[PDB]
């Protein structure tokens, strides 16, 4: 889940079905994650929840 | 965050700010929370 | 020119 | 950032439009050759009616 | 120097672009000074 | 912050390989491409 | 000339090319890249407008 480049993933979601949904799909893994006064954006990786 | 942050550029957009975005939205396609503080402005910004 | 991954 | 972003998303896209055509080549020489063998049976039909 | 503030020099800018000078270079004469009206603003 | 640095460690030989044998197996396995949901759809309600 | 004797003003900047306007290539580019739909099914693959 940790080393998954958004990039390729699009590509692989834009192979198996319509490419506004493998678009929704790669910008909702690209998300700011926060706790507390913690926060960063999540540009690599998986976001499992 | 998105809009009273008064680091945000709030005006027209420079031109060398626009190939930024575009070559930026060609090599991270739909990462705009990504794009966005290379760019430097906020991601709703640069994908309007 | 070698690729070095984060955890090494 | 890197600049392998740029050689990765290029090699990326390339990668896709050259499966593209080479699925548009596949899928003519497979639709012609049905067309043949569609041809063939009909010939075949002619030659038993 | 400002643009309303030096009227002169842009004056002097203009005739000199206009002795030499295209209708681009005019055009990024009339962008700065846009800018610089912009950051005398 | 390290993957901004030091670029994506997938090699784009390896992506490119990787999306060809996706290519190529699912072509192999006639698939036929998910497509948006439809507004005439007629399984929205239940899904939903 | 002393021992003969003796005995365009205008400068424009050329115009920048049509094809090195970046924007809209870069534009085209990304029209012809993004919205092109899955491989699988085939489809015409829209011309780059790189050029130079």
């Known amino acids: 889940y940790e080393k998954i480049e958004l990039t390729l993933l699009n590509s692989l979601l834009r192979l198996i079905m319509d490419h506004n949904l493998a678009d929704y799909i790669t910008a909702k893994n690209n998300v700011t994650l926060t706790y507390k006064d913690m926060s960063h954006v999540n540009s690599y990786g998986m976001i499992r929840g | 965050n998105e809009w009273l942050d008064p680091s945000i550029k709030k005006i027209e957009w420079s031109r060398e700010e626009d190939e930024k975005l575009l070559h930026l939205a060609k090599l991270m396609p739909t990462q705009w929370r990504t794009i966005a503080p290379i760019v430097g402005r906020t991601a709703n910004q640069c994908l309007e | 020119n070698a690729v070095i991954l984060h955890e090494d | 950032i890197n600049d392998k972003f740029a050689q990765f998303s290029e090699a990326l896209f390339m990668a896709d439009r050259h499966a593209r055509e080479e699925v548009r080549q596949r899928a003519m020489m497979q639709q012609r050759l049905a067309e043949k063998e569609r041809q063939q049976k009909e010939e075949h039909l002619r030659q038993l009616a | ?41 | 912050h390290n993957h901004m640095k030091d670029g994506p460690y997938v090699s784009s030989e390896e992506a490119v390989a990787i999306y060809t044998t996706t290519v190529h197996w699912l072509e192999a396995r006639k698939f036929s491409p998910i497509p948006f949901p439809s507004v005439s759809y007629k399984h929205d309600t239940k899904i939903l | 000339s002393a021992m003969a004797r003796e005995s365009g003003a205008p400068i424009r900047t050329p115009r920048a090319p049509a094809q090195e306007d970046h924007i809209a290539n870069e534009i085209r580019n990304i029209k012809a890249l993004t919205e092109t739909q899955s491989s699988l099914l085939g489809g015409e693959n829209a011309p780059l407008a790189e050029g130079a």
């Open chain 5, 1 to 41: 120097c400002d643009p309303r503030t030096n009227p002169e020099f842009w004056a002097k800018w203009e005739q000199f672009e206009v002795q030499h000078g295209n209708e681009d270079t005019f055009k990024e004469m009339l962008r700065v000074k846009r800018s610089v009206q912009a950051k005398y603003n």
